Amino acid sequence: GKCKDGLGEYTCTSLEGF
Amino acid sequence: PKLLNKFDKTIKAELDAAEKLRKRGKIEEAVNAFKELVRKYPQSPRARYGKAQCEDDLAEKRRSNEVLRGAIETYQEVASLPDVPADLLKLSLKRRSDRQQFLGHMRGSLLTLQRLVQLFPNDTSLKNDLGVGYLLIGDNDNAKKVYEEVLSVTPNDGFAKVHYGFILKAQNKIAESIPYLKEGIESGDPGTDDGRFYFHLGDAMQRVGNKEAYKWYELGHKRGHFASVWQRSLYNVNGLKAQPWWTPKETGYTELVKSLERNWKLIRDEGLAVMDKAKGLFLPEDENLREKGDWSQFTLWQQGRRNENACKGAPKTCTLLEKFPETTGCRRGQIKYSIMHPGTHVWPHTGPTNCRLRMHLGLVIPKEGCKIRCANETKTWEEGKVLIFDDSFEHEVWQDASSFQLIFIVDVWHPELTPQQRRSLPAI
Ligand SMILES: O=C(O)CCC(=O)C(=O)O
Ligand SMILES: [Mn+2]
């Protein structure tokens, strides 16, 4: 899930390494 | 922390000499020092852990994903050796999962966390870590089962309480989430002082009419989680100019605003054509922000990426917008149509980040019944006119007209963000 309008997700970014 | 097994105690001098080189920053020297120990003593868990930690530091020094993947494998090798001390076994596997999550190997991290729970069934914090692994992949069902299993054994665990309340609140179990969120934060356990839990405890209290909601917004502000009681975004660049309402001149995006207001009817017309001929392209808003009514959006850009199929439904609009990278390149914003029908009320809410400003271009605005509040000020839209607000401030919308409302939403980078920050900030 993506945080488009709000903050409903546990994390809103997606870590992809360095 | 007992890290040396029986044999490792007999080579404690060599292991300490190699580790001292790593603590001194002589990474290459320490790498070869542990390489020699792993050669001479291929079963030594402490030598293998030193090899992994040196690969871990070398990956940080190089910012290299490939070097870190090698470290992740060596942390695994530690766990495979005979006679591994329990403290060392836990450290090696926990770091393995932590580094797997860093690379985005969320499924692999999950396997490592499950193995840790299998090896140490009495460590409740490892179950809490497993629950976080499920939350990171978006599996709230399995995360809920994990924390219910924790709360069966340890009901007073604050970490389990906040995360259970977070899951309940995400599932729209608003009233049920409040005591878990509240008592979890009040416990003060490690991992409970998190802005996510102040944010949703106050919001849950707002939805049920609990007047104590802003007391928790003030406590979150005092502990550094919120920029202010009104602006509660959690992904912030500190210092950006903070105000609920912006004029076009204040944003500096006067050329974009002029283009939107000169060309608004072509944007409206393509939105209406989608309503009439391809209405399924409007998707109901699915972030649990709708209190009642009917609210849907048709997204052309998200995270700075153009949806090619969607732009086939609004080709002229997408062509116009492509000239403005300040919005098409806003990887923390969207470009989308928004439809609200009479009887619609959007809960007071806050966007995720202070790094964007939100423009609304009025396309179809009924004469009465429609208004938007941001912080302490409520305004109305006008057809063909742009209003601009910072949606990281608490805002709210009512639609009580006698026909539909259609607006065009255009997010831009906060004007004080440098070009460097606009390239490097993680997308949201
Ligand atoms: O998101 C919408 O489409 C409704 C208005 C709103 O809450 C916003 O623009 O952030
Ligand atoms: Mn909003």
XYZ file of C-alpha atoms and ligand atoms in Angstrom:
457
model
C 0.000 0.000 0.000
C 0.984 3.600 -0.720
C 0.484 6.702 1.431
C -1.072 8.960 -1.205
C -3.553 11.046 0.816
C -2.793 9.905 4.366
C -0.570 8.037 6.830
C -2.466 4.767 7.176
C 0.466 2.487 6.332
C 3.102 1.366 8.820
C 5.832 2.612 6.480
C 5.241 4.953 3.547
C 8.627 4.581 1.827
C 10.200 1.516 0.209
C 13.798 0.705 1.122
C 15.829 -0.569 -1.845
C 19.349 -0.750 -0.452
C 21.998 1.948 -0.696
C 27.056 -11.307 26.139
C 28.741 -14.722 25.948
C 29.932 -15.049 22.341
C 32.773 -17.593 22.683
C 32.123 -21.334 22.780
C 34.607 -23.806 24.274
C 37.063 -23.834 21.365
C 36.723 -20.093 20.723
C 37.848 -19.426 24.300
C 41.181 -21.085 23.460
C 41.827 -18.634 20.590
C 40.377 -15.624 22.412
C 43.600 -13.647 21.912
C 43.563 -13.969 18.116
C 39.845 -13.163 17.904
C 40.237 -10.067 20.092
C 43.221 -8.864 18.053
C 41.235 -9.140 14.818
C 38.137 -7.477 16.282
C 40.278 -4.642 17.650
C 41.398 -3.880 14.086
C 37.762 -3.619 12.978
C 36.868 -1.297 15.861
C 39.860 0.830 14.834
C 38.485 1.155 11.289
C 41.242 -0.889 9.599
C 38.569 -2.752 7.662
C 40.839 -4.371 5.065
C 43.297 -5.469 7.764
C 40.457 -6.860 9.883
C 38.959 -8.625 6.848
C 42.217 -10.494 6.251
C 42.669 -11.098 9.986
C 39.293 -12.833 10.240
C 39.879 -14.517 6.869
C 42.974 -16.163 8.359
C 41.064 -17.239 11.475
C 38.250 -18.706 9.365
C 40.902 -20.563 7.366
C 42.717 -22.008 10.391
C 39.510 -22.514 12.414
C 36.725 -23.218 9.892
C 34.212 -24.108 12.629
C 34.795 -21.015 14.796
C 31.516 -19.074 15.156
C 33.260 -15.952 16.479
C 35.709 -15.878 13.565
C 32.807 -16.231 11.123
C 30.899 -13.454 12.898
C 33.961 -11.229 12.583
C 34.100 -11.974 8.860
C 30.428 -11.026 8.533
C 30.789 -7.822 10.564
C 33.777 -6.757 8.457
C 31.757 -7.393 5.296
C 28.973 -5.368 6.935
C 31.322 -2.444 7.592
C 32.867 -2.761 4.124
C 29.396 -2.544 2.569
C 28.760 0.654 4.537
C 32.128 2.061 3.448
C 31.357 1.340 -0.218
C 27.561 1.850 -0.050
C 27.555 -1.437 -1.967
C 24.498 -3.687 -2.136
C 26.588 -6.597 -3.436
C 29.024 -6.497 -0.510
C 26.106 -6.403 1.934
C 24.517 -9.469 0.328
C 27.774 -11.291 1.035
C 27.623 -10.180 4.669
C 24.025 -11.422 4.894
C 25.185 -14.859 3.745
C 28.049 -14.927 6.254
C 25.687 -14.016 9.101
C 23.743 -17.089 7.974
C 26.909 -19.217 8.003
C 27.480 -18.336 11.671
C 24.131 -19.905 12.578
C 25.053 -23.091 10.672
C 28.242 -23.860 12.601
C 28.371 -26.293 15.531
C 28.208 -25.153 19.144
C 27.155 -21.559 18.484
C 26.497 -19.640 21.731
C 22.922 -18.434 22.101
C 23.878 -14.756 22.409
C 25.979 -14.934 19.236
C 23.332 -16.910 17.337
C 20.724 -14.242 18.097
C 22.988 -11.294 17.231
C 24.047 -12.776 13.892
C 20.513 -13.630 12.755
C 19.002 -10.351 13.981
C 21.599 -8.364 12.032
C 20.940 -10.595 9.015
C 17.233 -9.731 9.074
C 17.984 -6.047 9.692
C 20.268 -5.968 6.651
C 17.736 -7.924 4.585
C 15.089 -5.293 5.352
C 17.561 -2.567 4.371
C 18.021 -4.106 0.917
C 14.265 -4.628 0.590
C 14.440 -8.438 0.862
C 11.310 -8.328 2.990
C 10.357 -11.939 2.247
C 13.845 -13.138 3.169
C 13.807 -11.090 6.369
C 10.515 -12.790 7.251
C 12.127 -16.237 7.005
C 14.983 -15.075 9.238
C 12.599 -13.615 11.827
C 10.543 -16.822 11.852
C 13.706 -18.866 12.396
C 14.668 -16.599 15.304
C 11.252 -17.134 16.908
C 11.660 -20.884 16.364
C 15.122 -20.912 17.959
C 14.175 -18.659 20.911
C 10.484 -19.339 21.639
C 10.598 -17.444 24.961
C 12.050 -14.177 23.580
C 8.947 -12.011 23.230
C 10.883 -9.196 21.531
C 11.700 -11.507 18.618
C 7.984 -12.125 18.089
C 7.494 -8.352 18.118
C 10.227 -8.106 15.475
C 8.441 -10.772 13.431
C 5.264 -8.702 13.659
C 7.189 -5.734 12.264
C 8.360 -7.883 9.358
C 4.741 -8.668 8.517
C 3.825 -4.984 8.834
C 6.622 -4.022 6.436
C 5.378 -6.371 3.695
C 1.792 -5.191 4.186
C 0.482 -8.421 5.756
C -1.629 -6.957 8.546
C -3.514 -10.243 9.025
C -0.409 -12.242 9.954
C 0.916 -9.278 11.944
C -2.347 -9.216 13.905
C -2.060 -12.931 14.703
C 1.519 -12.445 15.927
C 0.639 -9.663 18.362
C -2.454 -11.517 19.590
C -0.140 -14.451 20.317
C 2.210 -12.111 22.197
C -0.637 -10.492 24.139
C -1.894 -13.954 25.126
C 1.365 -14.570 27.009
C 2.461 -11.023 27.953
C -0.617 -8.756 28.153
C 1.328 -5.771 29.542
C 3.877 -5.596 26.699
C 3.743 -2.019 25.444
C 5.330 -2.744 22.062
C 2.661 -5.346 21.311
C -0.076 -2.987 22.524
C 0.744 -0.038 20.244
C 1.227 -2.248 17.189
C -1.983 -4.156 17.895
C -3.786 -0.836 18.280
C -2.170 0.354 15.053
C -3.462 -2.722 13.209
C -6.937 -2.395 14.735
C -7.036 1.285 13.778
C -5.933 0.489 10.218
C -8.836 -1.989 10.045
C -11.282 0.817 11.015
C -11.788 -0.712 14.483
C -11.500 2.803 15.841
C -12.960 2.434 19.337
C -11.156 -0.861 19.959
C -7.790 0.627 18.956
C -7.873 3.502 21.458
C -7.048 1.611 24.704
C -4.300 -0.392 22.988
C -2.737 2.730 21.462
C -3.141 4.761 24.664
C -1.866 2.173 27.151
C 0.938 1.223 24.769
C 2.323 4.756 24.543
C 1.787 5.264 28.280
C 3.869 2.153 29.022
C 7.043 3.844 27.792
C 8.469 0.531 26.590
C 11.165 0.690 23.881
C 9.501 1.156 20.510
C 6.315 2.826 21.774
C 7.506 6.462 21.556
C 6.780 6.605 17.831
C 5.027 9.359 15.900
C 2.821 6.811 14.139
C 1.058 5.957 17.395
C 0.462 9.519 18.594
C -0.863 10.308 15.110
C -3.448 7.523 15.037
C -4.414 7.659 18.720
C -5.371 11.309 18.308
C -7.130 10.592 15.019
C -9.084 7.675 16.497
C -10.153 9.908 19.391
C -11.168 12.591 16.883
C -13.395 10.158 14.984
C -15.201 9.075 18.178
C -15.578 12.606 19.553
C -13.064 12.223 22.388
C -11.997 15.774 23.258
C -8.686 14.482 24.688
C -7.372 13.984 21.137
C -5.365 17.208 20.953
C -3.770 16.482 24.330
C -2.050 13.589 22.542
C -1.154 15.809 19.589
C 0.560 18.196 22.014
C 2.450 15.336 23.675
C 3.563 14.134 20.249
C 4.662 17.667 19.379
C 6.621 18.038 22.632
C 8.472 14.772 21.900
C 9.569 15.819 18.405
C 7.160 13.716 16.334
C 5.064 16.575 14.898
C 6.157 19.959 13.586
C 3.100 21.388 15.360
C -0.286 20.385 16.742
C -1.860 21.226 13.356
C 0.874 19.879 11.030
C 1.306 16.194 11.847
C 3.043 14.727 8.787
C 5.699 12.147 9.665
C 8.044 12.316 6.631
C 9.390 15.842 6.949
C 12.316 17.972 5.909
C 12.741 20.274 8.891
C 12.627 24.033 8.432
C 10.310 24.229 5.415
C 7.947 27.209 5.545
C 4.815 25.999 7.343
C 1.434 27.605 6.689
C -1.964 26.055 5.878
C -2.868 28.279 2.901
C -0.590 29.531 0.107
C -1.018 32.088 -2.639
C 0.312 31.326 -6.138
C 2.937 34.072 -5.797
C 4.112 32.602 -2.484
C 4.736 29.197 -4.080
C 6.638 30.719 -7.007
C 4.823 28.330 -9.374
C 3.067 31.198 -11.129
C 3.612 29.748 -14.615
C 1.938 26.458 -13.664
C -0.995 28.279 -12.052
C -1.414 30.521 -15.103
C -1.442 27.491 -17.408
C -3.983 25.626 -15.264
C -6.288 28.650 -15.140
C -5.927 29.491 -18.847
C -6.473 25.872 -19.943
C -8.885 24.610 -17.272
C -11.749 23.733 -19.618
C -9.728 21.133 -21.540
C -8.864 19.532 -18.196
C -12.525 19.619 -17.144
C -13.722 18.259 -20.492
C -11.444 15.214 -20.397
C -12.452 14.538 -16.793
C -16.119 14.689 -17.783
C -15.454 12.393 -20.748
C -13.990 9.812 -18.365
C -17.042 10.205 -16.113
C -19.318 9.596 -19.091
C -17.395 6.924 -21.014
C -14.795 5.337 -18.709
C -16.073 5.903 -15.175
C -14.263 2.826 -13.837
C -11.003 4.766 -14.135
C -12.160 6.717 -11.070
C -11.245 4.531 -8.100
C -12.891 4.926 -4.682
C -10.552 6.511 -2.157
C -9.235 3.577 -0.148
C -7.190 5.048 2.716
C -10.124 4.997 5.194
C -10.456 8.797 5.078
C -14.106 8.906 3.942
C -16.567 9.323 6.803
C -19.580 9.019 4.494
C -20.630 9.537 0.911
C -18.895 8.784 -2.374
C -15.354 9.908 -3.182
C -13.198 8.672 -6.062
C -10.001 9.669 -7.842
C -8.506 9.204 -11.315
C -4.719 9.348 -11.016
C -2.484 10.483 -13.897
C 0.819 10.742 -11.972
C 1.960 9.159 -8.714
C 5.447 9.191 -7.165
C 6.585 11.206 -10.174
C 5.640 8.407 -12.589
C 3.157 8.832 -15.426
C 0.416 6.214 -15.716
C 0.397 5.574 -19.460
C -3.038 3.931 -19.616
C -4.620 6.690 -17.519
C -3.124 9.406 -19.726
C -4.800 7.737 -22.704
C -8.027 8.869 -21.018
C -6.792 12.451 -20.632
C -4.166 12.891 -23.367
C -4.401 16.680 -23.728
C -4.233 17.185 -19.957
C -1.154 14.971 -19.668
C 0.492 16.819 -22.566
C -0.126 20.137 -20.802
C 1.214 18.877 -17.466
C 4.382 17.369 -18.987
C 5.706 20.922 -19.401
C 5.867 21.345 -15.591
C 8.407 19.021 -13.932
C 7.744 20.738 -10.591
C 4.610 18.564 -10.428
C 5.317 15.656 -12.796
C 8.623 15.154 -10.981
C 7.156 15.481 -7.489
C 7.848 11.945 -6.292
C 6.059 12.765 -3.015
C 2.829 13.868 -4.699
C 0.229 12.998 -7.307
C -1.691 14.454 -10.229
C -5.281 13.254 -10.186
C -8.920 14.111 -10.726
C -11.184 13.950 -7.678
C -14.976 13.467 -7.660
C -17.169 13.927 -4.589
C -20.932 13.500 -4.601
C -23.515 15.047 -2.250
C -23.602 13.570 1.229
C -19.816 13.164 1.350
C -17.684 14.084 4.364
C -13.938 13.449 4.552
C -12.583 12.875 8.050
C -10.132 15.510 9.297
C -6.769 14.128 8.257
C -3.163 14.910 7.395
C -0.961 13.956 4.452
C 2.249 11.991 4.910
C 4.858 14.660 4.147
C 5.602 18.377 4.448
C 7.628 18.216 1.206
C 4.664 18.915 -1.094
C 2.043 21.603 -1.563
C -1.368 20.658 -2.933
C -3.106 22.654 -5.669
C -6.815 22.268 -6.429
C -8.129 23.449 -9.797
C -11.902 23.812 -9.734
C -13.530 21.983 -12.647
C -17.202 21.482 -11.696
C -18.102 23.326 -8.488
C -21.754 23.590 -7.381
C -22.709 27.060 -6.201
C -23.487 25.917 -2.636
C -22.658 23.004 -0.367
C -18.926 22.462 -0.987
C -16.140 23.658 1.298
C -12.649 22.669 2.424
C -11.098 23.475 5.797
C -7.339 23.551 6.329
C -6.313 24.171 9.954
C -8.503 27.041 11.252
C -9.663 28.412 7.867
C -12.447 27.109 5.610
C -12.604 28.117 1.942
C -14.576 27.419 -1.227
C -13.454 26.385 -4.697
C -14.137 28.300 -7.908
C -14.366 26.835 -11.401
C -11.211 27.620 -13.353
C -9.368 28.912 -10.275
C -6.527 27.349 -8.293
C -6.402 27.206 -4.511
C -3.259 25.972 -2.766
C -2.919 24.471 0.706
C -0.355 22.414 2.614
C -2.096 19.084 3.157
C 0.381 18.153 5.889
C -1.901 20.372 7.987
C -5.141 18.848 9.228
C -7.778 19.399 6.550
C -11.380 18.379 5.990
C -13.943 18.454 3.170
C -17.751 18.563 3.028
C -19.928 17.976 -0.051
C -23.599 18.816 0.567
C -24.535 20.141 -2.872
C -27.265 18.847 -5.213
C -24.891 17.514 -7.911
C -21.336 16.259 -8.312
C -18.100 18.123 -7.584
C -15.018 17.650 -9.772
C -11.568 19.071 -9.021
C -8.069 18.585 -10.412
C -5.350 17.930 -7.826
C -1.769 18.938 -8.675
C 0.969 18.361 -6.094
C 4.219 20.347 -6.320
C 7.500 20.185 -4.446
C 7.668 22.588 -1.535
C 9.362 25.616 -3.160
C 12.130 25.795 -0.538
C 13.399 22.299 -1.400
C 16.685 22.411 -3.300
C 17.141 20.547 -6.603
C 19.395 18.145 -4.684
C 16.642 17.318 -2.194
C 14.119 16.860 -5.009
C 16.349 14.228 -6.631
C 17.319 12.263 -3.514
C 14.260 12.193 -1.223
C 12.624 8.733 -1.139
C 9.374 8.608 -3.080
C 6.095 8.627 -1.160
O -8.030 14.067 -1.759
C -9.114 14.456 -2.380
O -9.369 14.150 -3.525
C -10.054 15.268 -1.535
C -9.460 16.533 -0.946
C -8.292 16.262 -0.041
O -8.401 15.727 1.056
C -6.917 16.649 -0.574
O -6.806 17.245 -1.640
O -5.915 16.280 0.181
Mn -6.391 15.201 1.911
